[PDB]
Amino acid sequence: ATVLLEVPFSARGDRIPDAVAELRTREPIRKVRTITGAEAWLVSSYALCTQVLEDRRFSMKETAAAGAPRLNALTVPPEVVNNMGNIADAGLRKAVMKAITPKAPGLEQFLRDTANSLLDNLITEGAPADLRNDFADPLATALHCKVLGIPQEDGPKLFRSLSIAFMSSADPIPAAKINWDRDIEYMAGILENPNITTGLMGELSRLRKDPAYSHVSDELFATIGVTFFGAGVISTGSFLTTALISLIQRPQLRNLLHEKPELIPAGVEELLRINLSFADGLPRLATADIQVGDVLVRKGELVLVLLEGANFDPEHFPNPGSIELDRPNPTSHLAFGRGQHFCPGSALGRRHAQIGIEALLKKMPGVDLAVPIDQLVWRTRFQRRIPERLPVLW
Ligand code: HEM
Ligand SMILES: Oc1ccc(-n2cncn2)cc1
Numbered sequence: 001a002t003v004l005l006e007v008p009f010s011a012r013g014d015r016i017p018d019a020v021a022e023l024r025t026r027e028p029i030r031k032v033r034t035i036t037g038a039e040a041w042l043v044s045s046y047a048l049c050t051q052v053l054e055d056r057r058f059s060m061k062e063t064a065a066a067g068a069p070r071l072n073a074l075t076v077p078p079e080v081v082n083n084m085g086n087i088a089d090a091g092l093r094k095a096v097m098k099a100i101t102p103k104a105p106g107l108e109q110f111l112r113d114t115a116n117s118l119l120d121n122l123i124t125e126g127a128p129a130d131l132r133n134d135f136a137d138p139l140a141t142a143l144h145c146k147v148l149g150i151p152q153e154d155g156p157k158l159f160r161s162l163s164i165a166f167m168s169s170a171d172p173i174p175a176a177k178i179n180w181d182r183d184i185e186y187m188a189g190i191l192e193n194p195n196i197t198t199g200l201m202g203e204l205s206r207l208r209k210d211p212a213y214s215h216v217s218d219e220l221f222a223t224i225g226v227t228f229f230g231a232g233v234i235s236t237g238s239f240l241t242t243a244l245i246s247l248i249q250r251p252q253l254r255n256l257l258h259e260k261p262e263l264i265p266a267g268v269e270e271l272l273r274i275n276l277s278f279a280d281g282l283p284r285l286a287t288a289d290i291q292v293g294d295v296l297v298r299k300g301e302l303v304l305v306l307l308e309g310a311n312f313d314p315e316h317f318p319n320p321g322s323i324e325l326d327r328p329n330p331t332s333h334l335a336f337g338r339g340q341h342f343c344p345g346s347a348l349g350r351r352h353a354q355i356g357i358e359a360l361l362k363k364m365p366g367v368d369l370a371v372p373i374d375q376l377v378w379r380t381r382f383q384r385r386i387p388e389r390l391p392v393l394w
Contacts, residue, residue, distance in 0.1 A: 007032045007042060007304065008168075011378040013242045013276040013385030014249070016308055016321070020044060024309055029293045032304070035170045035381070038069035040302040041295060042281060044309025046316040046334075048293050052305050053338040058284035058297075060341055061085060069302040071283040072168040072383075075176040076227070083227050084341065090216040095207060096224060097344055099200035100147055100232070102351035107146065111352065114142045115359035123363065127393035128370040131360075132241045132386065139356050140237035144229050147348065149199025150190055158183060158229055166234045166383040168280055180226065187225035188218060201225050232345050235277070236352040238384040239335075243271040243353055244360070245376075245390065246323070248369055253323055258361040266325040268353045273311050273333035274323065279385050281306040282337060310334045364394035 009017045023030060028045035043049050052058045062068065064078035079086065087093050102108060118138055122129035129135070141155040161179035190201050191208060204221050207213045247254050247267075257267050281304025286297045297303060311333045312320040336343035343349070360367060369392060376387035 004031060004033045004039065005042075007034060007040070008280055011279065011380045011382075011385055013378060013387070014245050014373060014376070016276065016312055020306070020309055020312065024313060028309075029295045029297075034069075034071050034302070034304075035168065036070045036072065037170075038071075038302060040069060040071065040281075040283075040304045041292070041297055042304050042306060042309075043292065044306045045293075046310040046313035049305045049307070049310040049334060050338055051292060052284060052303055053282070053334070053341075055290065056340050057286065057288045057290060058303055059287050060284060062285035062287055063283045063302070065285070068285055068300070071280055071302065071304060073170065073172045075165050075167060075169075075173055076180060080223055080227065083223065084344070086220055087224060090220055091213065092204070092207065092216070092220075092224070095203055096200065096228070099203050100228065100345055100348050102348045104147075108351065108355065110146055111139070111143055111355045112359060115139055115356050116363065119359060119363040123394075128391040129393075130389045131244055131367075131392050132237070132388075132390040135360070136240040136244065136356065136390075137233075137237040140233045140240065140352060143236065143348075143352055144232045147199055147232070148190075148225060148229060149196050149202040150225075154186070158186070159233060162230055162234050163379075163382075165230055168381050168383045183226045183230075184219070184222045187222040190225060191218070191221055200228060228345070232348065234384060235343075235345070236349050238277045238386045239272070239275055239349065240353050240356050241386055241390055242275055242277050243268070243357070244367075245369075245373075245387070246271055246274060247357070248367060248392070249373070250323060251368075254361065254367070256325075257357070258365050261358050261361070263325055264354050264358050265350070266330065267323070268350060268357065269330045269333075270323040270325065270327070271353070272335040272350075273317065273330075274321070275311075275335055276308055277384050277386070278307050279383055280304065281309075282341075305334075307334045307337075364392075366394045367392050368394065 024044045028048050029043045032042040061082040064081035118135050141159045145152050145155040164175045190196050191205050196202050284303045286301050290297050314320050336346040371391050379386050
């Protein structure tokens with residue numbers, strides 16, 4: 001006898017497990033058991049992942065209901081799972097989206113100057129360098145302090161919450177409450193701080209005192225600061241780190257992009273497509289009985305949308321393991337999700353990776369791993385796949 005197939009399959013972010021293609025071909029929706037012991041439907045083809053993500057009867061908000069089958073334990077309060085819905089209901093969606101575009105005057109030059117400073121510091125210190133802790137994550141943190149309008153020197157303490165806040169745990173995490181309550185108190189103080197006049201928190205601070213938003217709660221304003229910092233920093237730092245592995249493992253492409261930097265946006269879109277940064281399928285709870293493939297999903301059941309299942313599906317992306325800069329469908333991957341919950345930071349996340357890669361390739365054209373690839377240590381039981389250190393030489 002064996003037990004039901006367990007997810008996730010592997011915390012490694014540098015290779016896709018052969019099980020994914022076997023599932024996708026033979027059983028593109030099939031039952032699995034999550035780390036909590038709950039059963040779920042794992043969906044692994046492009047067609048069925050898109051069907052679930054575009055049908056709001058597969059609800060994100062409902063995953064937080066008491067008694068639901070769970071992928072993992074909540075690390076935020078249950079109403080915060082509906083964060084974008086609460087931002088939309090408060091009349092703040094357009095304002096939030098406007099503040100986190102990468103097109104803000106000076107923002108790109110700030111990102112390039114920051115990237116070049118971090119790189120020069122590594123060059124001065126000498127190889128080996130850790131491109132996660134001393135490049136990708138400080139670049140993500142500096143970017144998000146600038147986009148929020150908060151002091152750069154407050155970035156490192158806010159960042160140190162994230163190794164707990166983005167855990168994928170079977171059980172509630174006492175330190176995630178301690179750090180969440182402290183980080184909310186910090187954002188509530190930012191909203192009362194007259195020095196904060198720029199970025200997303202300077203905008204929220206003004207709208208909080210405008211009569212049209214006098215009944216939006218202070219808790220929501222503070223929650224937008226904590227969630228957009230945390231989601232943006234973990235997501236951009238982790239994507240850029242694993243994209244740098246994928247580039248270092250393709251010297252032919254590295255060299256192409258160094259020679260023709262105008263191809264960096266196409267290269268980043270393929271690095272998004274092949275990225276294994278999300279450690280778990282995206283969860284949704286069915287609110288109706290819905291046919292998906294050969295399965296009738298029942299109301300109340302959990303569905304998990306496996307992004308690499310869609311993004312490596314050869315029916316959509318032929319030769320899916322290869323980075324090809326001339327595909328006819330290059331932005332149709334699911335790396336930012338799809339539908340109602342498509343990532344609101346997508347443009348910012350693209351620009352952070354394009355600028356970090358352009359800066360790295362000009363400063364360290366010979367960048368290579370300084371350890372054999374199997375020696376990277378992959379974080380476990382986390383919502384992202386990331387190596388704990390990324391040692392390189394150049
Ligand atoms: C390359 C970087 C990024 C990747 C790969 C990424 C990926 C994703 C994905 C896959 C979703 C959909 C989750 C779902 O449907 O269940 C999502 C949602 C989200 N992302 Fe991003 N993200 C990135 C950067 C950002 C940035 C820069 C921010 C903010 C500054 C951000 C904020 C959010 C938020 C707040 C949501 C929830 C949206 C909702 O619930 O409607 N992300 N992201
Ligand atoms: O809109 C958001 C929802 C959940 C999160 N987090 C999930 N784990 C940690 N934060 C961040 C933003």
